Structure formats: structure tokens, C-alpha cells
Amino acid sequence: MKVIDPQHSDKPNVLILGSGWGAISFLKHIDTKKYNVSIISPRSYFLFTPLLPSAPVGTVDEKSIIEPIVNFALKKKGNVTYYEAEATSINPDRNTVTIKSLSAVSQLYQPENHLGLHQAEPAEIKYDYLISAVGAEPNTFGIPGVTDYGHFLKEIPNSLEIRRTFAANLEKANLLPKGDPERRRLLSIVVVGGGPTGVEAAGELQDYVHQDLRKFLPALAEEVQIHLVEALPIVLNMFEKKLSSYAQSHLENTSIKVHLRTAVAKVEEKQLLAKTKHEDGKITEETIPYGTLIWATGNKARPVITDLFKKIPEQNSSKRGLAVNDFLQVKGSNNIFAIGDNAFAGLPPTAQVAHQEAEYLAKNFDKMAQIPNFQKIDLLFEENNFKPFKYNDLGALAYLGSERAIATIRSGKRTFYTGGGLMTFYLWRILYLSMILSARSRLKVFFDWIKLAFFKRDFFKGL
Amino acid sequence: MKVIDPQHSDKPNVLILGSGWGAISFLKHIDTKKYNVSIISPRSYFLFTPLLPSAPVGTVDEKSIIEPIVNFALKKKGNVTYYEAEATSINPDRNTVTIKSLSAVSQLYQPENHLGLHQAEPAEIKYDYLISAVGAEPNTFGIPGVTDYGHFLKEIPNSLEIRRTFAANLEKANLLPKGDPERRRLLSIVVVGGGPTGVEAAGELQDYVHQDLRKFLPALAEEVQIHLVEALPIVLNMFEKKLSSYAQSHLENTSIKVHLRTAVAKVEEKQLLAKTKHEDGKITEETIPYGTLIWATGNKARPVITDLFKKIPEQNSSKRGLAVNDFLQVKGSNNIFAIGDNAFAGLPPTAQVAHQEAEYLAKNFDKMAQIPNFQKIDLLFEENNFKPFKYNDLGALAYLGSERAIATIRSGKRTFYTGGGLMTFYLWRILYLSMILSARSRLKVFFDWIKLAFFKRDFFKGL
Numbered sequence: 001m002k003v004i005d006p007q008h009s010d011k012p013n014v015l016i017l018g019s020g021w022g023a024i025s026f027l028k029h030i031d032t033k034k035y036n037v038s039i040i041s042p043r044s045y046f047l048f049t050p051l052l053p054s055a056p057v058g059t060v061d062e063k064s065i066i067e068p069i070v071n072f073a074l075k076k077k078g079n080v081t082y083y084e085a086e087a088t089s090i091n092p093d094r095n096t097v098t099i100k101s102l103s104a105v106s107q108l109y110q111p112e113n114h115l116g117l118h119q120a121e122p123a124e125i126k127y128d129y130l131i132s133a134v135g136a137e138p139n140t141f142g143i144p145g146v147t148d149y150g151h152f153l154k155e156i157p158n159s160l161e162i163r164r165t166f167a168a169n170l171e172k173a174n175l176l177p178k179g180d181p182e183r184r185r186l187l188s189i190v191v192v193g194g195g196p197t198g199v200e201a202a203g204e205l206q207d208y209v210h211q212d213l214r215k216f217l218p219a220l221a222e223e224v225q226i227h228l229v230e231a232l233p234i235v236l237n238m239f240e241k242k243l244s245s246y247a248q249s250h251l252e253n254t255s256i257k258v259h260l261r262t263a264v265a266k267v268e269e270k271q272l273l274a275k276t277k278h279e280d281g282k283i284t285e286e287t288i289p290y291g292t293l294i295w296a297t298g299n300k301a302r303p304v305i306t307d308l309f310k311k312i313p314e315q316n317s318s319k320r321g322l323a324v325n326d327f328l329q330v331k332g333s334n335n336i337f338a339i340g341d342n343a344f345a346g347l348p349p350t351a352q353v354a355h356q357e358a359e360y361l362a363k364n365f366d367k368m369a370q371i372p373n374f375q376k377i378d379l380l381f382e383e384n385n386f387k388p389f390k391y392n393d394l395g396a397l398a399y400l401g402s403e404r405a406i407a408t409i410r411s412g413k414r415t416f417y418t419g420g421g422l423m424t425f426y427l428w429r430i431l432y433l434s435m436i437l438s439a440r441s442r443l444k445v446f447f448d449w450i451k452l453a454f455f456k457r458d459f460f461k462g463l
Numbered sequence: 464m465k466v467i468d469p470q471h472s473d474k475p476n477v478l479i480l481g482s483g484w485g486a487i488s489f490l491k492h493i494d495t496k497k498y499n500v501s502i503i504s505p506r507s508y509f510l511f512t513p514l515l516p517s518a519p520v521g522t523v524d525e526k527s528i529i530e531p532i533v534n535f536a537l538k539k540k541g542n543v544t545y546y547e548a549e550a551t552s553i554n555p556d557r558n559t560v561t562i563k564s565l566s567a568v569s570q571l572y573q574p575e576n577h578l579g580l581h582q583a584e585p586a587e588i589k590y591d592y593l594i595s596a597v598g599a600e601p602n603t604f605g606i607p608g609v610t611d612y613g614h615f616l617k618e619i620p621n622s623l624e625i626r627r628t629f630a631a632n633l634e635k636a637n638l639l640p641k642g643d644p645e646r647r648r649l650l651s652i653v654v655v656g657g658g659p660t661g662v663e664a665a666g667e668l669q670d671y672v673h674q675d676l677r678k679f680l681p682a683l684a685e686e687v688q689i690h691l692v693e694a695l696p697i698v699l700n701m702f703e704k705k706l707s708s709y710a711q712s713h714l715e716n717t718s719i720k721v722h723l724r725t726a727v728a729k730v731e732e733k734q735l736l737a738k739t740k741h742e743d744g745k746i747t748e749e750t751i752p753y754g755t756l757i758w759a760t761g762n763k764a765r766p767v768i769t770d771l772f773k774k775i776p777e778q779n780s781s782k783r784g785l786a787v788n789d790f791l792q793v794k795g796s797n798n799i800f801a802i803g804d805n806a807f808a809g810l811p812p813t814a815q816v817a818h819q820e821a822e823y824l825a826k827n828f829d830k831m832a833q834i835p836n837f838q839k840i841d842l843l844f845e846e847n848n849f850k851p852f853k854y855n856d857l858g859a860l861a862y863l864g865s866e867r868a869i870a871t872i873r874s875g876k877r878t879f880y881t882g883g884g885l886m887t888f889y890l891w892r893i894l895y896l897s898m899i900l901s902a903r904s905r906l907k908v909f910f911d912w913i914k915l916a917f918f919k920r921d922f923f924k925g926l
């Protein structure tokens with residue numbers, strides 16, 4: 001029951017799923033004069049994901065790296081509607097999306113109708129065009145105990161989960177004798193995954209222990225050991241070998257224990273079982289005690305996207321995401337497009353890709369608005385002469401803790417970077433500041449870093 | 464069982480109850496070379512209470528107005544111990560204090576012993592001298608339903624309670640038709656008490672509705688009605704009539720409904736029953752619908768202090784607090800002192816009084832340290848010639864919303880203030896900044912106000 005469907009104004013109804021890099025980047029550029037835009041997301045704010053590993057330890061505050069959706073939609077003059085809910089089903093034949101857990105509906109620049117909805121009432125939202133940018137969810141690879149005892153580093157609530165857990169562990173630990181193995185275990189941290197997220201989590205967590213906890217509890221800070229576990233033989237494989245080696249070397253210098261070629265077989269309450277392949281080809285088993293476990297590895301398709309694979313013939317054999325065109329149209333559909341991590345275009349699952357794909361698609365949409373026929377669609381694209389999406393790889397950045405970073409800025413073939421250590425850290429900061437999507441978030445993080453210089457981090461367990 | 468008692472170092476063991484204005488002001492001045500100090504508080508941070516009414520709505524962040532105890536104790540070179548727990552009983556004859564809900568123990572500048580305590584283990588802490596600064600708790604006057612449906616504005620968690628409640632109400636409201644009385648009720652707020660806390664809560668809440676909520680949901684913001692209920696015939700009675708009148712007039716200008724001479728008889732889930740005495744002497748009953756109820760009125764003695772009234776003969780008939788001397792010694796005890804809201808010295812329950820009392824007492828303590836006899840105590844004070852505590856009333860400040868405040872700065876007989884509106888607001892800011900107890904908190908609030916100028920408030924319901 002319940003079908004929300006506005007059809008008086010002579011503009012196509014465009015429906016966006018998500019409020020992340022794809023959805024919000026698309027929202028910033030879509031022509032709200034030519035189109036009526038509706039967003040569906042259970043998260044009422046944009047998350048600047050590259051600074052999330054700084055949240056738990058309080059190098060940056062949570063509020064500093066998030067921006068409410070409404071602020072973005074307010075800069076758009078035309079009509080925008082936001083449904084604070086999550087899409088549970090996409091319905092191609094009906095051209096509707098079923099929602100669930102409706103918390104609120106905000107209708108900006110719309111002094112008009114009342115939809116007649118109640119909180120947590122199921123509803124279908126009609127669309128003329130659909131943009132899917134729901135993202136991916138963390139992948140445990142079916143390794144037992146990951147979700148039971150481990151914390152992902154995916155969203156803002158995960159930042160609070162980790163702080164509470166580690167804070168509780170530090171308190172419990174400090175009441176025990178120095179020899180006690182339980183004290184050593186509770187002070188131990190394990191981060192799984194050697195990508196930017198894992199490495200930066202480990203580095204920020206190490207920055208806290210050395211720079212803050214050491215000042216008032218040096219006996220504890222000394223006993224804290226951070227571990228970083230990676231299945232491949234190299235950390236940060238998207239960088240050059242020279243930079244990976246420096247990244248690894250540097251982490252080791254700050255007393256982070258790097259387990260390369262090590263895969264977690266199972267996670268228990270107080271330890272994880274890890275297998276390690278050695279140079280010669282032999283496999284050995286380890287046990288790594290831990291008090292806090294951070295899981296920052298693979299991506300998996302969401303149920304909403306998985307369910308949609310079955311409803312479209314040519315998506316039936318998809319796995320990692322929606323198989324998409326060079327025009328970012330979902331294969332088999334006439335009016336659904338997919339950008340970011342939820343779409344498979346043979347590109348990396350990065351914000352950089354989601355951003356470009358969004359800009360590309362938004363520019364295609366105002367081009368559609370001028371052509372009479374868009375007032376079957378696959379053929380119109382190639383017939384009306386406009387370009388396939390071409391990803392330009394701008395490179396990669398990464399913070400390694402202790403005021404050192406690695407960077408590679410490029411464009412096309414030409415590489416032109418400065419990727420040492422302390423200088424790259426200052427670059428890493430300025431560059432991250434410049435690609436924040438709002439002035440508020442930009443000023444907030446800026447103030448966070450200035451405060452850090454003088455007073456070094458807030459670590460409140462209940463806040 | 465379990466008695467913590469350090470007795471090798473030749474210094475008196477001074478035990479402080481609380482981590483508020485009294486306890487921390489006393490901690491800042493106590494001579495840690497002449498004394499060993501231990502603090503017991505369930506709150507591990509100092510709260511700058513005058514800015515608490517700015518927390519819920521996000522004019523200031525919660526973290527900006529709190530400062531960890533350890534930071535204060537770190538500036539003291541001598542030994543300081545903090546028990547994260549609450550005192551459940553004071554034992555005069557044993558000279559110990561029973562504690563409960565022990566979360567942690569931190570021993571600063573003490574590379575020494577292990578106390579052998581577990582979390583939530585009952586324990587008695589021995590003392591040579593005791594300083595009680597536990598404060599008062601909010602008084603409902605036994606009016607039914609206050610605690611069931613109302614929110615106090617006393618501590619940091621109360622700030623989050625109010626934001627969550629109002630946020631939920633705004634969401635529920637916006638899904639209803641404009642005529643609907645439920646929409647009008649959910650958008651209605653009632654603040655009980657016309658003191659600085661109540662008035663400032665109302666004003667800050669009104670600043671949010673006009674300045675922020677109006678920008679993206681003007682239909683909602685228009686329907687929001689804030690009520691301020693006061694039992695006396697005047698708002699802010701500590702000020703001159705001229706300033707109260709301007710305070711009242713101004714609140715009314717910003718569309719706050721001021722119910723003077725109105726007392727709440729009972730609080731129900733969706734409304735409160737209020738009685739109003741009129742000019743001629745007649746009493747009428749009202750019903751005030753509400754969605755959010757903030758209760759900012761009287762103070763009551765804590766159970767810990769109430770229980771102690773029975774254990775000391777001369778405290779048997781006490782009610783509002785511990786009956787104290789001119790030397791701030793608890794009458795009937797030889798080694799217990801009381802400062803702030805938990806002690807009754809015939810002075811107002813204010814931070815200003817707690818601060819002065821603390822400084823006075825701390826200065827008495829290093830004076831005791833030089834006199835051999837303190838290596839029965841009532842008589843030593845008057846015999847050794849030092850002064851009774853004399854409260855100097857520096858006056859009163861208050862924010863009224865919409866960038867207006869009222870102030871009265873004085874000292875002794877001489878009054879010399881500037882208490883108009885917009886100018887007084889700038890004074891009100893600078894003065895509040897100057898009496899914040901730490902540089903960090905000072906810089907944080909400073910940055911909060913700068914950000915407010917450009918981007919106007921964060922109102923995240925889950926953060």
C-alpha cells in the first residue's frame with residue numbers, strides 16, 4: 001500500500017538512493033530547474049569518509065566531518081525532498097522503491113502538499129529516473145566471530161563503538177598488576193586490512209597512545225601494542241613499492257607490529273586465529289590476543305542491490321555490484337543508473353571514482369533535458385553523440401601516523417607528486433581540506449587541527 | 464570490607480568529594496606539597512555550568528564546556544588520586560567515606576602502589592580531612608510526573624536527552640497536517656523556572672527555532688511555541704526591577720509566552736496542570752500542552768548529605784544543606800568542611816559562592832600546615848587569629864536570546880555595570896570566557912562562537 005507520486009509539474013521525477021559521495025556529488029550538480037529531485041537515505045548527513053579514521057581517537061570530532069543533507073539541498077533553488085528512511089526493495093516494472101524505517105520527510109522550497117505518512121510506515125516512492133548510490137557494506141568473508149567481537153570502521157556510530165571499547169579496556173587494564181597477561185591483552189589492539197583505512201586507523205590510534213595517554217598514564221601507554229594484519233605481502237598496494245616500503249618501515253618505527261601475508265581464519269572473544277604464508281611457501285598458525293579489534297577490509301553488495309540482481313535478467317550473474325554501461329546505466333534497465341561502490345564498472349571502489357561518476361552523470365542529465373525525446377534509452381545515448389564515462393585517476397594519499405604521510409598526485413599519464421614524509425603530511429592536510437564538500441566541515445576540521453597543536457585530543461567515552 | 468589508607472608520607476590525607484565548582488576550585492589552590500589530595504566523583508570532568516543551557520541546541524558543543532579532572536591534577540606537582548566513583552556514605556567516627564560504582568582509579572605523579580580494587584567493588588576511603596562539595600540535586604517539590612516526563616538541565620547527559628526529545632518531536636510533527644493539534648503540541652516547549660537557567664534555556668531554544676530551523680522548515684518553525692513558567696511575579700529576581708522588566712519584555716518580543724505567578728500542580732504525559740494567582744487574588748487553572756518539558760527550578764540536598772544529618776547531633780535538624788561555620792567547618796565535626804550547594808551558610812546556591820568559599824578554604828589549609836598543632840579544631844581557628852569567610856557579591860549576568868543580555872557587575876557597595884542589551888551581550892561573552900577554568904575549554908567555546916557566526920549550530924540527534 002501507499003504510493004507517493006507527484007505528477008503535476010512538468011519535470012521528470014529523479015530519485016536518488018544514498019547520501020554519500022555518489023548521491024551528494026550528484027545532488028550538487030543536478031539541474032533542479034530541469035528536474036525534481038528526491039533523496040532516500042537512512043543517514044541524514046553526508047560523511048567525509050577519508051577522515052573517519054581520525055574520529056575514534058579525537059584528532060577530529062565526529063561533527064566536524066559530517067554535513068546535514070538539507071544544507072546541500074538548500075543551495076539548490078528548485079524542489080528537493082528527503083525521506084529519512086532506507087530502501088528495502090527496488091521495483092523496476094513499477095518504477096518504485098519500497099522504503100522502511102521512515103523517521104522523517106523534509107520538503108525544501110515546497111510550500112505545498114502533505115504526503116500523509118507516519119513514522120515506520122511502509123511506502124513506495126515512484127520515480128521516472130533512479131540513481132542508485134547506496135554504497136557497499138563491510139565484508140567479513142564469512143570468517144566466524146568478526147561481527148560478534150569486532151568493530152567495523154565504516155560509519156560514525158562505529159567511531160563511538162571503538163572509543164567506548166578501548167576506553168573501557170584502558171580502565172580495566174589500569175586496575176591490574178603490570179605483569180598480568182590480562183593487562184597486556186586489554187591494552188592490545190588489532191586492525192585487519194592494510195589499506196588506507198586500516199593503516200590510518202592504526203596510525204591515529206598510535207598517535208593517541210604516544211602523544212596523549214603517555215602524558216598521564218605512561219605505565220599503560222608503554223604496554224599498549226597495536227597490530228596490523230594484511231593478507232597480501234604488501235601494505236597499501238595502490239602505491240609504488242618504494243612508498244609501501246617506507247609506509248611499512250615507518251609504522252614499524254612507531255612500534256606497530258605489521259603481520260604481512262597473514263589471513264585471519266577465525267575471531268574469538270579474546271584472540272584471533274591467523275595463518276601466515278612464508279617466503280619458502282610454508283604456512284604457520286599464530287594466536288594474537290586482542291582487547292579491541294578493528295575490521296577494515298573488503299566490500300560486499302548490499303541486500304537491496306543483491307535482491308535487484310534477480311529482478312533483471314542481465315544482472316542475474318552479477319556479484320560485486322550492478323553491471324553498468326559506459327553511460328553508467330544499469331544493464332537491462334531503461335531508467336536506472338548506478339554510481340559508486342554499488343555499481344561495478346571495473347573501477348576501484350573509491351570516493352574519487354564515485355565523485356567523477358556523479359559529475360559525469362549530472363552533466364548527462366541536463367543534456368537529456370534539452371533533447372525532446374527524453375520528455376530504448378541505451379540507443380538514444382549513442383545516437384545523440386555524447387561521451388562514455390572515462391575515469392581519470394588522480395592518484396592516492398595516505399596518513400601513516402606521527403606526522404608523516406605518503407602521496408601520489410597524477411593526471412592521465414603525467415605523475416607530479418611530493419610523497420616523502422613530513423612535507424607530504426602538510427600536503428595531505430591541505431589537500432584533504434580542499435576536497436571537503438562544505439565550508440562548515442572545512443572550518444571545523446581546521447579548528448580541530450589548530451586545537452590539536454596546543455591541547456592534543458578529547459577522548460570522552462560517553463560523548 | 465576494604466579500607467584504602469595511605470600512611471607513610473608525613474602529610475595529612477585530604478579527601479575532596481565532587482568535581483564541580485567547589486571541589487575543582489579548591490583543588491586548583493590547595494598546596495599539594497603540604498597535603499596529599501584524593502578526589503571522589505562519579506564525573507571525571509569539570510562542568511562549566513553557566514554555558515550548559517547552550518549545549519542542547521548546539522550554540523556550544525558539550526565537549527567545549529567540560530574539562531577532564533586529570534588535566535587539573537596534572538598542573539599540581541604533588542600526589543593526587545582520583546576515584547571515579549560516588550560516595551554513598553560519610554562515616555565521621557571512622558573518618559572514612561564509603562564509595563560505590565567504582566569505574567577507575569588514576570594515581571597521578573605516583574610511581575608506586577597498587578590498591579587492589581575491582582570495578583563496582585564497595586570500598587571505604589580513609590581521610591584526615593574531608594571537603595564535601597557534592598552539590599545539590601534538582602528539586603521537583605514532589606509534583607507528580609516531573610521525573611517521568613520532564614528533563615532536568617543539570618548535567619551533560621541532560622543536554623543530549625533534550626536534543627533527542629525535541630529532535631524526535633520535530634520529525635513526528637513535520638509528518639502531520641498544519642491544522643493538526645498534535646502538530647502544535649509536539650512543536651510546543653515548556654520551561655519551568657524563571658531563573659537564569661530557565662530563561663537562558665528558553666532563549667537558546669528560541670535562537671535555534673528562529674535562526675536555524677526557520678531556514679529549511681519555516682512551516683514548522685512558525686508553529687513552535689516556547690513557554691516559560693515562573694511561580695513568583697517576576698523573572699530573574701536577583702536583578703533590579705528595571706532589568707527584570709526588560710528581560711521579560713524582550714522574551715515576549717521573541718514570541719516566548721511568559722506565565723508569571725504560575726505554579727505547576729501536576730505534569731501529565733502530554734500536558735501540565737498549572738495554577739495562576741492574579742492581581743486581585745483569584746486563582747485560575749490552565750492546561751499547557753507540551754512536547755518537550757525542561758525543569759529548571761529548585762535545589763535539594765543529596766541522600767549522602769541527608770544521611771549525614773542523622774550521624775551528627777547538631778546537624779539533626781538541617782534541611783537545605785550541612786550547617787557550617789564562619790570557617791566553613793561542618794558544625795559538630797572536627798575535620799569535615801563543606802562548600803558550595805551542599806553546605807548551608809546562608810548564601811545563594813551559586814558557582815560564584817562555591818568559587819570564593821573554595822579559595823577561602825584552600826588559603827586556610829596552607830595556613831594550618833605551618834602551625835604545629837594541626838600536625839578542638841573549632842577553637843584553634845579563633846585562637847590562631849584568622850578571618851571568618853566573607854562573601855563578596857560580584858553581581859549577576861544573564862543571556863536572554865537574540866543577542867541580548869543583562870548584567871550587573873559590582874563589588875561590595877559599589878555598582879559599576881553596563882546592563883542594556885546588545886552591548887551587554889558582548890560583555891556577557893567576554894566575561895564568561897574569562898571565568899572558564901581552563902585554556903582548552905576557553906579556546907573551544909571561542910571557536911564555537913566564531914563557527915556560529917558563519918554556519919549557525921549543529922543539531923544532530925544521535926551525537
Ligand SMILES: Cc1cc2nc3c(=O)[nH]c(=O)nc-3n(C[C@H](O)[C@H](O)[C@H](O)COP(=O)(O)OP(=O)(O)OC[C@H]3O[C@@H](n4cnc5c(N)ncnc54)[C@H](O)[C@@H]3O)c2cc1C
Nearest residue numbers: 018019020021022043049087134135340341349350351352
Ligand atoms: C574509513 C574510510 C576511509 C576511506 N578513505 C578513502 C580515501 O582516502 N580515498 C578514497 O578514494 N576513498 C576512501 N574511502 C572509500 C569511500 O568511502 C567510498 O568509495 C565511497 O563512500 C563510495 O561512495 P558511495 O556514494 O558509492 O557510497 P557511500 O559514500 O558509502 O554512501 C552510501 C550511502 O548510502 C546510504 N545507504 C545505505 N543503505 C541504504 C538504503 N538501503 N537505502 C538508501 N540509502 C542507503 C548510506 O547512508 C550512505 O549515505 C574510505 C572509506 C572508509 C570507510
Ligand SMILES: Cc1cc2nc3c(=O)[nH]c(=O)nc-3n(C[C@H](O)[C@H](O)[C@H](O)COP(=O)(O)OP(=O)(O)OC[C@H]3O[C@@H](n4cnc5c(N)ncnc54)[C@H](O)[C@@H]3O)c2cc1C
Nearest residue numbers: 481482483484485506512550597598803804812813814815
Ligand atoms: C544549567 C545551570 C546553569 C547555571 N548557571 C550559573 C551562573 O550563571 N552563575 C552562577 O553563579 N551559578 C550558576 N549555576 C549554579 C552553579 O552551577 C552551582 O551553584 C554550583 O555548581 C555549585 O557548585 P558545587 O561544587 O556546590 O556543586 P556542583 O558544581 O554541582 O558539582 C557537584 C559535583 O559533585 C559530584 N557528585 C554528586 N554526587 C556525588 C556523590 N555522591 N559522591 C561524590 N561526588 C558527587 C558531581 O558529579 C559534581 O562533580 C548554574 C547551574 C546550572 C545547573
